Each structure stands twice: as C-alpha cells, then as structure tokens.
C-alpha cells in the first residue's frame, strides 16, 4: 500500500499541523 | 477506494487549514486596525 500508506502519512502530518494551531489558539 | 477516500480526507484537511489560515488573517488585520 505504499501509495495508500504515503497518502496516510501526508494526512497524518496535516493533522499534526492542525493539532498545534488549535492548542495555541 | 481506500486510497481515493484517504485523498478526500487529506483534501478536507488542507481545506480546513486554508480556512484556519484565513481566520488568523482576520485577527491579525484586526490587531493592525
């Protein structure tokens, strides 16, 4: 699933980014 | 369809960050006023 896996990895990284924006706000 | 569906989620996530980015542009332009 390296394409699925890779896309999961991108999705996860986007969720990290939101998690840190929200915790400051 | 799992690959297709994950891409849709990522798209929404990216869309959300764009909206969030807009929200902060509003507060920063509020601070400047």
């Amino acid at each position: 699933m390296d394409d699925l896996a890779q896309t999961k990895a991108i999705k996860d990284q986007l969720q990290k980014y939101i998690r840190e924006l929200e915790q400051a706000n | 369809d799992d690959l297709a569906q994950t891409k849709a989620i990522k798209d929404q996530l990216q869309k959300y960050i764009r909206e969030l980015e807009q929200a902060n542009d509003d507060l920063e332009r509020a601070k400047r006023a």
């Binding site: 969720q15 | 799992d2 929404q12 996530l13 909206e19």
Partner: protein, 174 residues
C-alpha cells in the same frame, strides 16, 4: 458488499475508543481527540452474510463540523454516541440526528437506520439512567439502544453487528 457506518457524538464520549476496541481490541486512557475523520475496515459475518464494514469516526468538537460533514453522505447507518457520565452528551442527541439528516441529506428519515450508544457504563457515577435513554430511543425513531464500555468491551461488538443487521434489514427492503 461494503457497509459504511458512521460514529457521531460529543467530544470525549468514546467514539474513537469504541472503534479501536471493536477493530483492534485495544483501549487507551490517553487517547487524543480526533482531528477531522478516520475510517477503519472490518470483515465480519452477520447471519450468514459475509460483509465488509467501513467504520467512520468523526471529531465531536464543534470547531471540526466543516471537517466531518462532507463525509456524512453515503452512510448506511448512523451510530449516535453519548456518555452515561455526561448528561450534556445525552441532551445533544437530537442535535446530532438533525445534523446527520441535513448533511448526509437523508430523505426518508423515518426509516434510516440509527443505533444509539450509551458508552462508559463501567463508570459508577452515572449521570443518565437506562430508562430515560430507553425512553428517548422509543420516542425519536424506536432505535436499538446499547449500553457499552470501550474500556471493558461490554456490548461493543454487539452494537456494531446490530448496525449491519439494520442495514441488511433495509437493503432487503428494496
């Protein structure tokens, strides 16, 4: 064939924990709030029928509404989740049904399959009783009601399996 089922409910009632218990038989005390949506696949057999269930987990927090709502559409069955230690999460059920009905755009709401979950029954100090939850289910669609614990695994498997039944029952309604 594939069955999409979706978990809706207030932040922290245990939607993620319910899904991780069912799919991976694990439980986590320090579980992070869901950011947007997640899904997992599980193969099962319900009443002879071999079936793949795609379980959609959503963020309960208000600020993530726009993140979750574009994934309501296409659900065969909705799992409304509240916590028995949280009266507010139970009062909100009407709102979560109304939100699912709008964004998935379910015409024929009178027959669409919902299954209600009172989670965290392992917690002694309850804040919602069994009868008042059972009352609400009888009056707002006559839905199946499951008292569950993601922590203990109580009635978790049964809750998800029942959702497939409700889907099979209306898919056989042609």
């Amino acid at each position: 064939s594939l069955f999409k089922v979706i978990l809706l409910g207030d932040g922290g009632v245990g939607k993620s924990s319910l899904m991780n218990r069912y799919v991976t038989n694990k439980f986590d005390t320090q579980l992070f709030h869901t950011i947007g949506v997640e899904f997992l696949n599980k193969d099962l057999e319900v009443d002879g029928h071999f079936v793949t269930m795609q379980i959609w987990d959503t963020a309960g927090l208000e600020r993530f509404r726009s993140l979750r709502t574009p994934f309501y559409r296409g659900s065969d069955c909705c799992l409304l989740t509240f916590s028995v230690d949280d009266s507010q999460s139970f009062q909100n059920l009407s709102n979560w049904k109304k939100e699912f009905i709008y964004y998935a755009d379910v015409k024929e709401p009178e027959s669409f399959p919902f299954v209600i979950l009172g989670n965290k029954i392992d917690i002694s100090e309850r804040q919602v009783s069994t009868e008042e939850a059972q009352a609400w289910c009888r009056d707002n669609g006559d839905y199946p009601y499951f008292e569950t614990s993601a922590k203990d695994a109580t009635n978790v498997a049964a809750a998800f399996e029942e959702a497939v039944r409700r889907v099979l029952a209306t898919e056989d309604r042609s």
